[PDB]
Design a protein around this ligand. Sequence first.
Ligand SMILES: [Zn+2]
Ligand SMILES: [Zn+2]
Ligand SMILES: [Zn+2]
Lengths: 1181, 370, 114
Amino acid sequence: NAMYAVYKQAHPPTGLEFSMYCNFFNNSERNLVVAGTSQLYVYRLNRDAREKLELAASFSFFGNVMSMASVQLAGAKRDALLLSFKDAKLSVVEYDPGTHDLKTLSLHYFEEPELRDGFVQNVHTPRVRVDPDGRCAAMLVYGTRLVVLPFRRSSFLPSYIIDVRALDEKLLNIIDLQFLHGYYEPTLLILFEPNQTWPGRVAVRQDTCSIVAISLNITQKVHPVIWSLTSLPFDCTQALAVPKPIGGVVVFAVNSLLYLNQSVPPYGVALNSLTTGTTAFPLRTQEGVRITLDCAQATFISYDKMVISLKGGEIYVLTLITDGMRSVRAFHFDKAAASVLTTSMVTMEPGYLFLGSRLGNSLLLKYTEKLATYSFEVCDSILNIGPCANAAVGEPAFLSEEFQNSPEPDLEIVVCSGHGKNGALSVLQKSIRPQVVTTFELPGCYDMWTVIAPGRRHGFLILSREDSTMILQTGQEIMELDTSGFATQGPTVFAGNIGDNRYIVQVSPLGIRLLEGVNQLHFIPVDLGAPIVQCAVADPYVVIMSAEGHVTMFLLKSHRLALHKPPLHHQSKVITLCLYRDLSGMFTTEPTHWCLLVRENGTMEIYQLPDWRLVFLVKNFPVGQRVLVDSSPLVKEVLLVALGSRQSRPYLLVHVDQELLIYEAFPHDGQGNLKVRFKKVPHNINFRERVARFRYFEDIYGYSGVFICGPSPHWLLVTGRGALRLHPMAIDGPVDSFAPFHNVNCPRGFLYFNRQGELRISVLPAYLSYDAPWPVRKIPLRCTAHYVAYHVESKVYAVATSTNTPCARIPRMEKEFETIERDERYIHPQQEAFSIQLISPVSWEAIPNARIELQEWEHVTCMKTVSLRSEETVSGLKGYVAAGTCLMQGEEVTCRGRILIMDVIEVVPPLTKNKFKVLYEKEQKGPVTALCHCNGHLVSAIGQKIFLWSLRASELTGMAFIDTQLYIHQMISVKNFILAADVMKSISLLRYQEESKTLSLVSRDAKPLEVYSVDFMVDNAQLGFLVSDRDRNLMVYMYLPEAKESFGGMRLLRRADFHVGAHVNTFWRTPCRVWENKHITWFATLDGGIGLLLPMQEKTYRRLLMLQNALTTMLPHHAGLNPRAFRMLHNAVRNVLDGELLNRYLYLSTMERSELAKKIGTTPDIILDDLLETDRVTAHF
Amino acid sequence: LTFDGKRMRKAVNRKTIDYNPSVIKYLENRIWQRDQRDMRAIQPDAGYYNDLVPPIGMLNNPMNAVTTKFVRTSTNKVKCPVFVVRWTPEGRRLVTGASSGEFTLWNGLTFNFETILQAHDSPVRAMTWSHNDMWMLTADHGGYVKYWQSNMNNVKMFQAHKEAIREASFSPTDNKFATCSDDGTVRIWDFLRCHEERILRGHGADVKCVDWHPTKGLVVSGSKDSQQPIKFWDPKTGQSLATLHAHKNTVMEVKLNLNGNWLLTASRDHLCKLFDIRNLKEELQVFRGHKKEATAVAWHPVHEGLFASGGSDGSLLFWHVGVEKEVGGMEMAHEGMIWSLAWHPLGHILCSGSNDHTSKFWTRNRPGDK
Amino acid sequence: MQEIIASVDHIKFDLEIAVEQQLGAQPLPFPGMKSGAAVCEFFLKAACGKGGMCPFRHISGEKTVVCKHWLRGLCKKGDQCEFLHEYDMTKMPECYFYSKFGECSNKECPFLHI
RNA sequence: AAUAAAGG
Ligand SMILES: [Zn+2]
Ligand SMILES: [Zn+2]
Ligand SMILES: [Zn+2]
């Protein structure tokens, strides 16, 4: 009796961790390779349109990247990336220029239990270093085994392992390792400390750290020591290799700065003055400086200077003052600027600097000069929304009054993002809600065109209809112009603008006519054997296609339309075509003109104009292959557009039977043919239930892009960065006609038909940004946000936040406060103060003067929206906001707490209509560590007991307690049950009885496990418990009394596992859209992604399991990793699919789909039914 | 001198070593730190009284758990030498068994007397908890094994050996256990019935330690016998898998590590030995430095290479596996011999019960002390 | 997540069926034990099957004052103790240290001073 | 009630 489920990645993670600057694509330009957990982004630095970074490529892995390096091999024409994955995996990959993807050059597994020396748990991450002269690489695996990989003058050789502790001067506890600059042989400088100590034991032992220079001879596997030093300060943190011609290392310790070299006494300098009685090293004070160098990032921006990002944000510029022979004499600090909490840092082109951050938005900065001072300027920022510490689910404020009266609810996710000076609230929605400015009722009409007439504001709304048409004047008020030069007599097949909007062309199934306002200039009748059915305008060309397959071209020569017949004599009937006015520079063999044509015999072709010359052909087009290549199923539509900055990135959209296909053009290179190929793009758009379904707009709110109409409508947007954004819009129904619009009521807006015969003139709600994986609004708090709680009846957000101050006192046993008194150069402690704010979803600005400050040293350990019984509401319950507080003085003070029940009320004021009503605030006889509700009671966790309180007449009244585990830190209830979570024991299932007033332990997981959070997998008449652990694993346990190993029911049996690959700290869950009482269970990971588990049937689970095995064994994967060993724990039960792999079936041609479904036995229609139904069921937010 | 709990003593501000501030600090560091490569270093200064995380907060430094700071000494009023000390599974409190057969229950936060019970009719020698935290199992001198519940109630008392039982341990499923005796045999028992499955008759005399394995079915024993000091057993079968000639004196204790790869043993020839449980032909390493015998050993419950030991002279030393020389220690911790050690389930307090009639509490050091 | 969006009230669970019927339950292996157990429903409605050795808490008598050892979790007379195992601070015993002398040393004294 | 006060 198990529970099956799919996993899905509802939002890719955002926080970046590594950055590098290398020749990724080729040896012409260099560009920025940044990484994340399981993600890789190659950005191209622009200098126009004002610097911005254009996303050039993006890849994802079945493995969390643990390190990254670059190398320039022997005969290669680009740099190879050496990536490092879990416990030992060194994978060397490269760029594939003929397919625009990432090829795996080699894969190295160094995972054998002989290498662990006994220890089962691994705490020593892989660390990959590369020699500056690209002559070898090193990888420190398991904290002991130094793997050496030479490169050839196949550019690879047999790697070999070294016992780093077998060397003379046995190494232990390695801190960090580097290669030096300026040696005839490669040389690894290792910083370690043989005799380890603790900041509580520096009185007993110090001067522990040492360094060694291991000169690696790769030709005959010899590696002696050349120089070592000992007794260095106990808390050395980092090593920095100093480029030539200075040439040494710079070693950071928490309180000092050291420079080391050959034949040079260690030049050390103490920065703050906590080096008193903790080092016997000779440290000379640094005068006008008082800082600490832990958790600091550093990079050299010249041979002499370097930049340092401290633990708090401040950016300094260190200069290595030298003698006449570049022997570092003294140092110089200089506080340049302040910035974000970096997590990496790299120097780009001279003048630029990328500060990578997983705690806030990554920043590209610029530095100019003015012995030198550098000022910094934020040039650009990459959005980040992690770590997602907590998440509330609240409803948006305004919804256009037509979109109400709808069954599906309208929801919104507020998330506690960032840390420190960078703590914000991220508001996320998934769809788009068009702000409906006005509505009409025009039944009968089935198509429209919005054309500019006489500064690019739209004139006539050329509508269309069955037998006749209709035209609206639309300058100030939407008024039906009648009796005009246009053709109202028949059904219009096209309408546009030619000659920089100076003209109009209305194409009808009898001829074409060109206009100049209301009056027509010219009309030429078109008869060729068949009626017109297709028309495509690229200024100054017009190409019209017939209902049978003839083609004819027009242009505007100096003033009406001129006839021309294209010499495309061929034996295959034509089905579709389009024109393309290229402003970019990619289509070569400055604007040019291109005609993309599709025939009946499968083929596709691309002609240049006006000559109608062949430059590119594809044999088997409608199948949907993955790279379109120049060769020497009912295709319904085809559209080729240029997007990005200044029309830089061309895509090809295709509507084939029930399928959407998206290609992006990339360059490549018979002879005399188009130098372009077309790589397929993955997506999740569903076309399942002669007018165009693709609608190009530019500047609908400031954005260029396309609208994909149909049963599942979508917005395809691209911005200054070439990041493609695919946003749903299904609040209205299935859209079936669209038009970009610009008036005095809808300035930079749009208008569209739905399928109830209604026009809607609308604009984009101008408070979210649409250049993000989801539409997001960031809200900076300048502090740290811990807990967020949407209070319902008030529609407000209660937010518990903190801020750091210096520290002055020290508590004692009768609670003396021994005041701290040090010299001037003393780095004070840090001390948090909490505040509980209100935030309004209307302006997303904090309500003025409704803020609860809390007593000094009083941390808040929890804040929830609990619904407690009361004789004032209909449903007998009502929601409050409760927060439990721990007053943590120190280790030697009996930690107490306090419970704080607030309400949010309505008062006579704009924003000041809401205030806190502190209904209860009282000290409890122990720490308060988590709380929830259970049928109207406040379930509090005080110390090591769990109490169930009743708030009557505004005073808490005990009713039951129970004795529990070490430290409860999470509790979640459902329907009389409670589920407690502990910090070293896994979980316990509890219960309450209104009648006898008795808690009771239903059962428990007797094994040990370090939980982060816990929730419920709700299924039809079943209930699992979803747990996430310290090891990035989700796990579903159940209560099965008749299971013969759930003995008396007194155990929880792990009925499913899954290795998500990321820490999850918060869950929530929503119903569906076979799915009767199944709930989707969502969560947010501490890396900035969103995910979901969906409960399934077994019948479907087995089919999709067969498919999953076939996909993982029959396809190649990026960097060779396999998606089976990546979803394993650390006994294993694995009743959970992958979801991120099943969607790869959607990315296969129909030939390959048929092959694989036959090698399983099933039918690709049934496969796609399962997959796409799982997709449409989880379409929320 | 009677102490019935009715004497009206004035208040006392008890010397406390609390863990809740440190745990709260750790829960707040989780959300914005990957691991200890994202940790801002604690300073050795007296004002950083809030920047301490528990042993789980840092796994790149086991040195923190070297508890050489005295806290509190817990002596009864009618003194007896202490034989075995065990934290209840949730760290709620601490239990001491002494040579009078009494259980003395001490608090685990302020360390004060809570209660006392007359448990055995004989010096209590063995005390251990099941892996599910439900059953406590005790053994006295020259006699019985008794079953205890979490509230310290006695549900079943059963004669096992005609002579003194020295140690015990549970099966990973807690359904069957072992007892080694002064009769030179190891008897393997069923639990729900008090039924004896096997008798193990390999030793020469006075099996004085036994221990099951966390996953496998192999039971280790250790004796006075200079000819077969350490032996292996298969419980269902009852056959000596191997024999281990490691110590030439009565091997006091024997400990299998939770990763299932390591054995550690301690003997009256001043030494402790770590053995790789699969390759028994050699000695994985020899922990030297004890001016007299070694009598008690205990692995740390969070860190995998850290353990503590105490000898016949009052010393208690702290050792780490990959490390050669002694890591830390306290020379005159007691006056008599340390009989039993116990780490706190969380790993920050160490209790040591000795032959000088007391039991002392040790904790981690404070930043920037004297 | 909220009681408005995802409302599991119209549903019955496997738990709620295997809890109020005591489905997986074996009798006690030793006589005399049961704090942290269900107040037996069958014994309330006079249908207790396990016969005195029921694995869940029997409530035979009526009791008046809170059990002094139960508050610390050390009561051995469970299911047969003379004193309530209920957390009702209005039915707590009287302070010895106040009733005899006249000055309690516990600032947070849970015992009824009077 | 079976040590609530076990800093005697
Ligand atoms: Zn009953
Ligand atoms: Zn009782
Ligand atoms: Zn009192």
